[PDB]
Amino acid sequence: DKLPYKVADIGLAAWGRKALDIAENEMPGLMRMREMYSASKPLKGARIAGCLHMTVETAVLIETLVALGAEVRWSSCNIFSTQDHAAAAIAKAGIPVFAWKGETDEEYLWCIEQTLHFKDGPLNMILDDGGDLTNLIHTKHPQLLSGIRGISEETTTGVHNLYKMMANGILKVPAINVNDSVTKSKFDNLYGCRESLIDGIKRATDVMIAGKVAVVAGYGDVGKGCAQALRGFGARVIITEIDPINALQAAMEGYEVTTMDEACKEGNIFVTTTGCVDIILGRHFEQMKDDAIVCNIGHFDVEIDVKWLNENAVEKVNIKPQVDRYLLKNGHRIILLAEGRLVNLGCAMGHPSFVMSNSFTNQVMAQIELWTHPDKYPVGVHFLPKKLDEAVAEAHLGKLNVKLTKLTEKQAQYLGMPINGPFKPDHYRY
Amino acid sequence: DKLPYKVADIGLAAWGRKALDIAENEMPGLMRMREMYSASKPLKGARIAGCLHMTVETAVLIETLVALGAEVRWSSCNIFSTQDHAAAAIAKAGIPVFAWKGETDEEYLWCIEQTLHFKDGPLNMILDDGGDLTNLIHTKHPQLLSGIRGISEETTTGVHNLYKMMANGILKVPAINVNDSVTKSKFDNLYGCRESLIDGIKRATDVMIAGKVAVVAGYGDVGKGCAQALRGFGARVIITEIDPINALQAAMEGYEVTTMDEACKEGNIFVTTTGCVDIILGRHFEQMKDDAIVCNIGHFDVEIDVKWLNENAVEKVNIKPQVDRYLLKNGHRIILLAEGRLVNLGCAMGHPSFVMSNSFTNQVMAQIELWTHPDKYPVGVHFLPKKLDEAVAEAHLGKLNVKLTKLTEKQAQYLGMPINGPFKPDHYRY
Amino acid sequence: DKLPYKVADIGLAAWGRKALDIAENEMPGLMRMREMYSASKPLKGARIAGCLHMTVETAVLIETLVALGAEVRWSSCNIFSTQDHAAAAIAKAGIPVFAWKGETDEEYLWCIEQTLHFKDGPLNMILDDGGDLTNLIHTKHPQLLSGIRGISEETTTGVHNLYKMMANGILKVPAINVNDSVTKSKFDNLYGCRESLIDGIKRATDVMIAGKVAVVAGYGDVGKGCAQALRGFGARVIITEIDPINALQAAMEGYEVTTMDEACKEGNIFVTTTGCVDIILGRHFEQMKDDAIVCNIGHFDVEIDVKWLNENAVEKVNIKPQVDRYLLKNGHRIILLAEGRLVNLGCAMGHPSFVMSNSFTNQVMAQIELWTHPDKYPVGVHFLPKKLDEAVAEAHLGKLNVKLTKLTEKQAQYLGMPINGPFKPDHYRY
Amino acid sequence: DKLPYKVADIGLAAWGRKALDIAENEMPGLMRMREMYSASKPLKGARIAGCLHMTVETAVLIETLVALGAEVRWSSCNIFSTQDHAAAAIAKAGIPVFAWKGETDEEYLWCIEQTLHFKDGPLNMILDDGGDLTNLIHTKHPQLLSGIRGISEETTTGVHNLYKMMANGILKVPAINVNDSVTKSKFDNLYGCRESLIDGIKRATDVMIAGKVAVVAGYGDVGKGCAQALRGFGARVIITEIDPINALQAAMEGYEVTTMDEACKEGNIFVTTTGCVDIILGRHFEQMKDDAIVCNIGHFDVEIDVKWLNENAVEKVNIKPQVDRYLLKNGHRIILLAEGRLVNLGCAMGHPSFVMSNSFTNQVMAQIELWTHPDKYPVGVHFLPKKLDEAVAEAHLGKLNVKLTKLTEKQAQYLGMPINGPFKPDHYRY
Numbered sequence A, B, C, D: 001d002k003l004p005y006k007v008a009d010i011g012l013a014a015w016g017r018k019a020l021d022i023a024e025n026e027m028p029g030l031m032r033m034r035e036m037y038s039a040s041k042p043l044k045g046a047r048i049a050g051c052l053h054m055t056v057e058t059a060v061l062i063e064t065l066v067a068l069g070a071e072v073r074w075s076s077c078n079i080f081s082t083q084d085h086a087a088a089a090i091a092k093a094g095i096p097v098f099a100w101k102g103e104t105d106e107e108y109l110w111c112i113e114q115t116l117h118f119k120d121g122p123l124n125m126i127l128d129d130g131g132d133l134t135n136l137i138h139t140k141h142p143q144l145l146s147g148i149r150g151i152s153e154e155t156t157t158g159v160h161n162l163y164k165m166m167a168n169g170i171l172k173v174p175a176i177n178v179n180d181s182v183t184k185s186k187f188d189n190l191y192g193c194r195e196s197l198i199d200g201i202k203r204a205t206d207v208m209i210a211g212k213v214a215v216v217a218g219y220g221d222v223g224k225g226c227a228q229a230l231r232g233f234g235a236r237v238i239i240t241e242i243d244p245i246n247a248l249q250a251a252m253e254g255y256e257v258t259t260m261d262e263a264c265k266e267g268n269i270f271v272t273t274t275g276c277v278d279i280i281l282g283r284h285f286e287q288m289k290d291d292a293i294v295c296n297i298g299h300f301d302v303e304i305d306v307k308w309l310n311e312n313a314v315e316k317v318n319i320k321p322q323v324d325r326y327l328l329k330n331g332h333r334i335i336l337l338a339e340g341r342l343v344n345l346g347c348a349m350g351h352p353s354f355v356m357s358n359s360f361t362n363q364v365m366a367q368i369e370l371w372t373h374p375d376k377y378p379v380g381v382h383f384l385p386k387k388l389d390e391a392v393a394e395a396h397l398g399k400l401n402v403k404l405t406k407l408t409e410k411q412a413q414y415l416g417m418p419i420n421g422p423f424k425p426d427h428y429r430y
Ligand SMILES: NC(=O)c1ccc[n+]([C@@H]2O[C@H](COP(=O)([O-])OP(=O)(O)OC[C@H]3O[C@@H](n4cnc5c(N)ncnc54)[C@H](O)[C@@H]3O)[C@@H](O)[C@H]2O)c1
Pocket: A155, A156, A157, A158, A188, A189, A192, A193, A196, A217, A218, A219, A220, A221, A222, A223, A240, A241, A242, A243, A246, A273, A274, A275, A276, A279, A297, A298, A299, A300, A342, A343, A344, A345, A351, B405, B407, B411, B423
C-alpha cells in the first residue's frame, strides 16, 4: 500500500512496549498460543486485515498472530478507541498499523482501506470487531471477497449483523462468531465492562458513584456487568429492557426495571449498554437532572441522540477531551461523555488485559481454524468447538492459581462423560 | 387403582389449602395459564402421571393441570420432599396423590406405581422430575410405553438421563426438556437454591453462616445460587469444579477454586451441588473440622458417602428429624443433614412459590405442547420455543411491577427483529 | 416462691439438652467464661433475676451464670420469644424458669414476678432485656431496690429507657449498658438480624424475597442488618429514616430513602427496625399491595398499628401460629406476622448461637463487674472497659480459626500503644 | 512572604476552574456554608495556614474559607497529592498556594513554611492534614504558637498524633478532631477509599481486579472501604489485623484474616490501610508472586519497606510516573506504586468531590468554631457538636434527593428526643 503505517506519535513506542511487556504477562491465553504455535506457525501464508480497537491488549494479539507466521495490517474500529503508545510500539515493530486516537470519519475509513492490500497480495483473512471491515469489503470491494478465507467477528453488534447478512444470503465468506463463545461473552462483556465502565466514567468526569441513581438501558452481559459495577459502589441502579426474560433476571437481582420515559427523570448517571437506536432522546434530556452524566458503552454510537443536544442546548462547553458539558434551555446541565461513542475505551483504557486474553485467545483460534481447516467452514457464521472454548478458560486458570478437579474413571463413567471431554452440552448456558 | 390416595394426615388439608391459597397469589405464571385455558381445557382427555416433590407449589401445578381438563395422579419424587399439609389439601380435593414425608424405598416405588393406572385407562402422559417415573416405565412397564404421548422432565439430573437414553435409542417416547428453559434453569436452580439452601441448613442446624468457611462442590446454576447465598451472609465460600469454564467464572467472582481433597480440611459447611458420585468421602470426613455441617442439594443423593459415616463413626446420635450428629474416631463431630438427600426440600420447604411459577409454567406448557401438537414432537428430547420461554418471564413481570420497554417500528427495523418476536438468538445464554 | 418453675412441656427437655449441647460448642465466649470461672465462682452469693427471651442460647447463659456460682430464676422478656424445649431443659435442670411460648400479658407479668424472690432472700441482681424487669421493680417493688447490686440491660430499647430514668433521677441502682458494647451492637443487632430476620419471615410466610420490593423503617444496626439481608436475596430494599446521618449511609449504600407515606404504596415486605410508635398505620395499610407481608423486629411491638387491622379489616383469617391474613375493604390482603411482636424470635429461632455468645459473654462480664466490683459502679448506666470488649471478640476468633497479628515492640512504640492494650480510642466507632 | 505563590503551571488554571466549577456543584456542604456565611464572614480577621492535599475539592474548601472572609495561604500535605490544574486555578485566583505534584522533601517543607506569614501578621489559625503543619510549628516555630487560635486535623494519623502531644502536655493550642466526626470517618475514609482505591491502582497499573487475591492490611474504615471495593470486582480479599474486634468484623463479613507472613505468599495485590510501620517487608517481598502489585493508602508512607526493594532488587525499571517494576533475585517482579506514598492521591485524583464535601464541611465548621468561640475550646483536642455533625449529613441529603422522615410530637415524646435535636447518644457508633 502507501506509507508503512501512520500513528499519533512513534516516540510513544518505547513506552508502549513497556505496557505491552506488562500486558503480556497478564494474558496467559495469547502467550499460551505463542509457545505451542510459534514454531508450528499455523498462520503462515495468511494475510490478516484487522479492524479492532488499537489498544495494548490488541497489540499482544497482533504480535501473537505474527508469531504464528501471519502477515498483519491493522486499524482501530473506533475513532477514539486507539491507544497511541500501543499503536506506536506496533508500528515501530514493523507491523503496518494505521490507527490513532481521535480520527475523523474520513481518516477512519482511509485507515481501514489501508489494510486491504499486502506485499504479496490482498487480504486473505479478516479479523473484524463491529463488522465495519467485513461490511466495507462486501459492499465496496467485492472483487477481494473470493480471496478471503474467513472472517473473525468479535463483538455482539457485528456478529448480529453477520447473521443478518446470511439471512439475506449477503454473507459471501465463512465467518466464525467469536463474541458468542462462553469464555468470550460471559467473561469479556460481563466482567470486562464491570471494571472498564466505571473507569471511563471516572477518568472522564471523576464523579462519585455512591448515593447516585444510575440508569442502565439494556440487561445483556454488558448491561449486567455495568449494573453490578455501579450497584457495587453504592449507586441505585435502575434497568430498562425490552426482553421479559432479561427483565426478570434484573428484577430477581433487586434492580428496578422501568422505561427510560420514566427513569430519565430520576437518573443521575445514564449508561446505554444497548445496541439499538433512540435509547436516550431529547424527550429524556429535557427531563434529566442538572449535571446528569450521560454516556454509551454499546459498540456503535446509535443509542444517545447527541445531535439533539447540539441542536437544542443553550450552550455547549468542553471540559476536556471527550467531555462536554451542555446547558439546556431549562437551566439544567448535561455532561456528555466521549461524544456518545464507547465510554470505557473512549475515556479510559478499555477492558483489562487478563479478560482480553480470553476473547483474544478465541480470536487466535478462530483464525487458525478458518485458515487451517477452511473446508470445514462453509459460508456462514460458526461457533468454536466447546472443547476449544474449554481450552481458553483452562488457559487462564493457572495464573489465578486455581486448582481444578479431575474426574475419576468411576465418576466419568457415572456422569457418562470423558474425564476431559466437553463437560457441558452445547445448549448449556453456563 | 387401589386406595383413592394415601398421605400422612388428611386433617392437614384445611391448613394446606391456606398455604395453597397464599401460594397461588404468588405464582402469576400458573394462575395465568389458568385464566386463558380454564375454559379451553387443552389438556382435556389427558391422563398425566406425575413424579415431582409433593409441595404446596406443586399443588398449584396439579390444580392447574386439572383446571386445564387433565386427569392427574401424583406422587413425590423424593422420600422426604413431600409436604404433608399440601398433599392433604390435594387428596381431600379428590386428586389421587400418594405421597407423604418420610417414605421408605419400598413405599416410594409403591407410590409411583400407584399413578400408572387411571379410571378410563393407563397414563397417557408423564410429568417427571428426576426421570424416576420415565425410567420405571421404560424398564418395567414397556407395555404402557406406546400409549404415553409425551414426557416432561423438570430437573437437570433427569434431563441428563433423558439424553443418555436417546444416546442409546432407549428413549421410546418424545420428551420435552423443561429444566433447560431460560426461565427455568437461570431462575429456579439459581435464584431458588440461593434462597432455599440456607433455609434447609438453618431450619436443620440453625447455624450462623457469618464467619464460616463454606465449601461448595460444583459451580452450576445451583452451585452458583448456593455460593452467592452463603457468601452474602458472611461465609467464605470455596468452590471445587471439574469444568474449567465454570471454574473460571468462580475465580472471576472472587471464589477460591480447589479440590475437595484440600477444602475438606478448611470447610465448616459442605454443600454438594454436583450431580455426580463420590464428592464427599470418608477420606474427607476423616479430615473435617469438629461439628462440620455436611449436606447435599443435588437431586439424587449420590454425592456424599453417608454409609462410610454410618460404618466408620464411633457413635451416631440423631438431633431431630433429618439431623444426625456423628462422632468420628478422631473425636471430631459431623452433622449430616437430611441423610444426604436434597437439603432445601428435606429440611426446609424448598424453593419459594414465586420462582416455582416459572418452572411450573414451563411444565404446563410442555404438557399442552406434547398433548396438543404431538406430531410436532418426534421421539427425542426437545426444548420449548423461545417465544414461549419469553411468555413465562413476561408473566411474572407484572407481579414485580416491572415496566418493560416496547421497541418502536424504527428500532425493531434497526435491530431487525419483531417488536415482540423472540429478542434473542437461540444460542443466547442470557 | 411458688411452683419450682412452669413451662410448656418438660418432656421437651431431652431434646432441648441436645440443642443446648450443640449450642454450647458454638458459643466460645460463654464456654470460655466457664473454664476460667467455673472454679473461681465470682458470682457466688449472687441471686440473678433475669428477663431475657428464653431460648437455647439464653439457656447456655443461665447454665454459665450458674457455673459461676450464681443463683438464677429466669423468665422470658417476650410472650412469644420463648423456646419450649430450651426452657424445659433448664427447668428439668433445676433452674427455676417460668417461661413458655405464647403467654398472656397477665401470665407474662406473673412469670416476671416469679423471679423476684429466692430461697435465701430476694433478688440481689438483675439481668434484663427490654427493661421490663428493672421497670417493674422500680415502679412496683421499690422495697427490693436497695438490695439489688446492679442491672444488666441487653437491648437498645431497654438501655434507651435506662438513660431516661437517670435523666429523671429515677434509676436507683447502678446499671451496665451491655447493648452498646462494640462486640454487642455491631455484631448482635447487625449480624444476627441479618440472618434471623429472613428466617422469621420465611418460617412464617415462606415467601420468596427475590424480585420483591422490601421496605425497612430505620437504618440502625438492626435496620442495616435487615436491609443487607433482603437486598442480598434480590429484593429491592427501600429505607425510611429520621436521622440524616443514618439516611446518608443508606443512600451511600445504594438504598432509596423515603417516607413510609410514599413507600407503603410500593413495598411488598414491610419490616420495622425502629423502636418508635406509629411507624406503619392504617393510612399505609390502606395503601399496601395485595398480600403485603408486614412484620416488626424492634423489641417492643409499638411500631405497627395492628388494632387498626383488627378494627378495619373486612375479615381476619389465621394461616398458622403467628401468621394472620387480613382482608381489607379495598380487596387487598395483608399478611401480619407474629401479631406485630419480634419477628425473628416470634416466628423463628432468633439470632444464631455464635453471635449470641458475643452479647452473652458481655452479659456474664457485666454481672461479674457489678457483683464483684460494686463500689466501682455508682448509680447510673455504665459501659464495659474496652479491654473487656476486646476480650469478647478475641474469644470467638479461634472458632473462626482467625489468625490475628501481634504488634512488635517497634510497631507498638511507633503507634504508641500496648502490644495488647486497647487498640482503639474510646470514641472509636469500629 | 516570598513569591505570591509557586506551582507547576499557571496555564493550567483555565482548566482547573472548569474542574472547580463542576466540583462545586457536587459539594452541597461547602456551597451550603457559602450561602449562609458569605455575607456573615464569620472567619473575617482569620489567617488560616493550610496543609491539605492540593486537589480540586480542597480548592473549593479554600475558596469557601475565603468566602467566609478568611485569609488563606495553602500547601499540599503530600509531595504527590497535588493537582496542578487545581492549584493553578487557586493561585491565578490570588490565593497564595505553594504546591505542585512531585515535590522534594526539601521543596515540600519550603512550601509549608511559606504559609506561616501573612500580610497583616503570621498565621492565627491552622488547617492541617497529617499533623505536619502543627508539628513543624510546635517544634520549630514555637514563637508563633501563642498566636494561633486553633488547629483543625483532618486525618486519623494526624489526630492520632494530636492526642499523643496532649498525652505529654506538648499540644500548646486547642485542636478540633475533624477526622473523627460521624460524617467524616464513616463517609470519607470508608466510602471515599472504596471508590478512590481502585482508581489509583487502575490508573497506575490498569490491572484487572477480578479473579485476583488482594491482601489488605488493617480493617479500619479505610481497610473496610478498600476491601469492599476489591471484593466487589471479583477479587479474593484477605485481611490482616492486630485488633480482635476489627478482625471479627472482617471474619463476620466473609474475609479471611491472617498474618502478612502468610498472606504475602498468596496475594496478587497488596494494600496497606494501616498507619503503622513495617507492614510489608523484604521478608514478604521475597515471598510475593511474580508481578505482585504493592501499594499503600495510609497517610504517611511508613508501612511498605521500599528501601529494601531498592537495595535488594536485581533491577529497577520505571513504567511511568509513580509506577516502578522491580526484579527480585528470585526472578519475580514487583510493581511498586506511587513509591509507597498514598495510592489514591498519588496515582489517581483522590476521593470524589461529593464525599469530600462532608469532611470539608466539618472543616469549615471546625474553623468557625475555634475562631468564633475560642474560649469554648481550651488547649486539647475536641469533637464537633453532634448537632453539627448532623448538619453536615443533612446538607448532602438533598442532592441525593433523599426524603428524610419527620418525627411527630407523639413520637418525639415516646422516644423522648427533640423532633430535630440530636437523634443519637454521643457513644453511638452509627
Ligand atoms: N465497549 C465495550 O467494551 C464492549 C464490550 C462488549 C460488548 N459491547 C457492545 O455492547 C452492546 C451490547 O452487547 P451485549 O453482549 O450485552 O448484548 P446483549 O444482546 O446480550 O444485550 C443487549 C440488551 O439490550 C436490550 N435492549 C435492546 N433494545 C433495547 C431498548 N430499546 N431498551 C432497553 N433495552 C434494550 C436487549 O433486550 C438485550 O438484553 C453491543 O453493541 C456490543 O457489541 C461493548
